[PDB]
Structure 1
């Protein structure tokens, strides 16, 4: 359950999430678009779900993709800000889960984002330790799907 998954976010996992977010979250537009383009590059099969965005290879020049990417980063910001209170983290996670459930995005599908996160992370000199911390956060959302 999402309640069990939220409990896996221990003291050090939270710390690693905050430390890395401090850097990644500094450039939401830049890292946001980088995140999405990497997803479409590594997992070409996911592009179908983003039909509304249009020509996704345009990257930053695509207003819809840019608007979506920035918005995704504020969702991550939301998660980071709720780390102190698991009750609040859970209700926020379940809120964002609703629309993904509506789009038939499964847990396995959602998990595709870990690759892109690991990459953007590595580009900022944050290794496996941080990639794994984020994978645990993503797992909380997966549990709600």
Structure 2
């Protein structure tokens, strides 16, 4: 249940999400591309789904990948801004879930993003505590897939 998953975002979890996002969200282009390139590097079997972006190994040099990566960061900005209202968080999560359901992305494969998130957080000196908080937000999307 997406509603039960959303209920897992307690005061402490929301605080950790906000605190880490203040830093990570300050460079959407840089960290967004870092998140994607890490996903492709550690989970090569997911590259096939991104055929529209072309040669993803080009990283920042690939215009389609950069446009996609920046936009992905605004989806996370959206989630963070809706943390105060569960009903609004759920409706935006369901909107993005559809974007992935149509691409045949399962809850299990969506969850592969947790590894890259932990690595990007770690590079900014945010440890397991923060990685786990983000895993709980990702779990809300998984509940909708």
Distance 2:69 2:99 in 1: 16
**1:1-145 equivalences in 2 (<5 Å):** 1-145=1-145
RMSD of aligned residue pairs (Cα, Å) = 0.3
Distance 2:61 2:107 in 1: 30
SS at match of 1:9: coil
Alpha-carbon offset, residue 88 of structure 1: 0.3
Q: Deviations over 1:86-133 (max 9, x none)?
A: 010000000000110011100000000000000000000000000000
Structure 2 alignment gaps of length 5 or more: none
- Structure 1 stretches of 4+ moved >3 Å: none
Alpha-carbon offset, residue 63 of structure 1: 0.1
Distance 1:41 1:104 in 2: 21
| TM-score of the pair, normalised by structure 1 | 1.00
Structure 1 alignment gaps of length 5 or more: none
SS at match of 2:78: helix
SS at match of 1:126: coil
